[PDB]
Design a protein around this nucleic acid. Structure first.
Length: 53
DNA sequence: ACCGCTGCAAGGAATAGGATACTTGCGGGCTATATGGCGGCGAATACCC
């Protein structure tokens, strides 16, 4: 299990750096204002989404 | 009971990379000052009576 908190301050490289080593790790991602790339990626179905408002 | 040594602090530069805004390089898409040709003719001045 990985838990990247406040993902919008890392960049793509830092986010998949650990993913490359452990290919099948379960990435949990917490944030409040996602950077547009990962927000579109979530809204397009690539990643599951959960809204807490 | 003096002294050279060791060790525990002090003193910070250069990059990665996500930001934020500057700086400009450009390309398409616009606006805006002579000196080697005559011949003929009719009309417009000049003039000196």
């Amino acid at each position: 299990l990985l838990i990247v908190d406040e993902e919008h301050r890392f960049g793509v490289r830092h986010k998949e750096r650990i993913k490359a080593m452990r290919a099948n790790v379960d990435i949990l991602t917490l944030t409040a204002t996602p950077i547009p790339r990962t927000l579109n990626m979530a809204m397009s179905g690539m990643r599951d989404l959960s809204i807490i408002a």
